[PDB]
Amino acid sequence: IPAEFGKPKQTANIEVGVNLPANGDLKDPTQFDFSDPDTYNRSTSSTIYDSMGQSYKLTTYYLKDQTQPNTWNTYYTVTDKEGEKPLNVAAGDAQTPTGHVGHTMKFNNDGTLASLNNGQPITSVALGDPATNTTPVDMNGADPAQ
Amino acid sequence: IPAEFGKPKQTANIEVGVNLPANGDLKDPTQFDFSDPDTYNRSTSSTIYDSMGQSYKLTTYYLKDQTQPNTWNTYYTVTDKEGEKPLNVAAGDAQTPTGHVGHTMKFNNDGTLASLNNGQPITSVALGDPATNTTPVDMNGADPAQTLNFGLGSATQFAAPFELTKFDEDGATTGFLTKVDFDENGSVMGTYSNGENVTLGRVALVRVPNEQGLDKKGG
C-alpha cells in the first residue's frame, strides 16, 4: 500500500460531452480567430497535465458553420506562460487561412451525433515538437511528443 | 552481548531522496554562493559524525540550472566551530568561478531520475586533508581522510514543491544496551541508545540423524 502516488500521469485521452445551440448565429469559417471573441460562437477552458505534472490551460473554440447546416468547427489552443499557442489536428478537415487546423462536427436531423472529422479519430499534433507543430508548446523539460 | 556500542562509526554513505520543484525559479550556475540565499533555490541541513563521534552540521544547497532545462546543481558545505567551509566533489561537473565543486543532476521527461554527475559515483574529497581540500575541515583530532558517498538514486523532479522525503546515513555514536529480543530465526538483536539495531549473533542448532543413540550425560 504505497503512501505516495509517485507517478505523474500525462493527459492522453480527453472525453468531452457538450450540447450545442441549434439556434446560434452562423459564423464564417475563414474568419476564425481565437484572439477575436466575435469570430466564433463559444469557448471553454480546462486543465491538462504533462509528464512532469505541470498544469496547462486548454481552451477549445466552437464555431457554427454558415455554409453547411448542422455543421460545427472545433479548434484548440494551449496557454503556457509564454502565451496562448494554437494546437493543430493531425487530419482535421478545417484549415483556416492563417494555418490553424480544426475538425468538423455534423449532426443528424434529430440532433444526435452524425460524424466527427469525416469519421477519423481526433488526435492532436505533438505539443512541444517543432518538427510537427508550427507553434510548439514550451514543455519546460517535459515530453515534447505528448 | 556487550553492554556498550563502544565503536563510534564515522559516516561514510548518506542516502538522500528528494523531490525537486519543476516550477521553481531558474538560477545562474556561475552566480552560486552559499552565503547568499537568493543565489540558489533550496538548502537543507543534516548531522554527520566523524571517526571520534563528533557531530558536524552538513548543509546541502540545490540550484536549478537556467541554461539547461531539467538540470540541477548540488553543493555541500560543512559547518564546524571555526566556520562554514565548502566541500568539493572529486569528479563533480559543476565548478563555480570561486572554486567550489558541485555535481549536476538531470531528469527524464516523466520527471524520473536520468543521470547523476555524468554517470559517475558521488564521492567527496577528504574533510580534513589539506592535500586534497582547499578548505580543510577542523577534525579536532578525528581522521582527516574521511570521505562521504552520497546516494541520490531516488531523487525526482515533479510539480510538487521541494520535499526531503528520505534521509539515511551510516554514522553512529556511543551508546548503552537498552533492550534485547530474539526473532524466530534465532538472531539475538539488541538496540542501544544511539539507535543502531546491532545483531549480536545467532543461536546454533544441532540435529543428529539417530537421536536414540545419544549417550546421556548429567543435567
Residues of A whose CB is below 8 A from B159: 8, 52-55
Contacting A residues, span 41-60, partner chain B, CB-CB under 8 Å: 51-55
d(CA A80, CA A140) in angstroms, rounded, equals: 10
| Residues paired with A85 in a beta bridge | A78
State how far residue B70 is from chain A, nearest Cα, in angstroms.
Answer: 6
A108 contacts A19 by C-beta, under 8 angstroms: no
* Inter-chain residue contact A52 with B156, CB threshold 8 Å: no
Number of A–B residue contacts, CB under 8 Å:
39
Confirm or reject contact between B96 and chain A (CB < 8 A): no
A91 contacts B149 by C-beta, under 8 angstroms: no
State how far residue B93 is from chain A, nearest Cα, in angstroms.
Answer: 21
* Inter-chain residue contact B158 with A51, CB threshold 8 Å: no
d(CA B195, CA B77) in angstroms, rounded, equals: 26
* Inter-chain residue contact A54 with B22, CB threshold 8 Å: yes
| Nearest CA among B182, B192, B135, B152 for reference residue B6 | B192
Nearest neighbour of B158 by CB, restricted to A53, A55, A144: A53
Method of determination used here? cryo-EM
State how far residue A56 is from chain B, nearest Cα, in angstroms.
Answer: 12
The C-alpha cell that represents B36 in the structure block: 547568499
Most B CBs within 10 A among A9, A11, A48, A52, hence the mutation to make, goes to A52
Contacting A residues, span 3-32, partner chain B, CB-CB under 8 Å: 6-8, 10
Burial A60-72 (b: 16+ CB within 10 A, else e): bbbbbbeeeeebb
